[PDB]
Amino acid sequence: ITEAALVRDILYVFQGIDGKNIKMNNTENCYKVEGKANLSRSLRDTAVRLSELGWLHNK
């Protein structure tokens, strides 16, 4: 995985269309990031902070 991939997937997740790697819909209420990438900071940890912008759109 790379930072760029996560920027475009987020640009779809700001609407409700799933990415390739941020792929969880609002069902258990948060867009769970996925994959064997490690690299916590941007990946596991920042993307979830942004995805709430999308959770508020689906509703």
Next chain:
Amino acid sequence: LQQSLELKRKMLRDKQNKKNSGQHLPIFPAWVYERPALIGDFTALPIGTLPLASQESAVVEDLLYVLVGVDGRYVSAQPLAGRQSRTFLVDPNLDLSIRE
């Protein structure tokens, strides 16, 4: 789809029996209804290997066909144009985020 021929048959007989006080309503030639005329919709590359940016760049021109009723190259209109609304056949190997 076909039954409009029968509806027009019932109708024109009824316009005649309303106009039993007259005669000689106009009617169109059958080619006006038989020809495709003004109706809407009717070897491509391995799009699974065509990369994500270009894959959008290929799909976005097909929408510019499909928005006027032309069968695109991906995302092509279905048969059974009947009932009351269309459905379309966007491919199983296009990227899921683009398909949605």
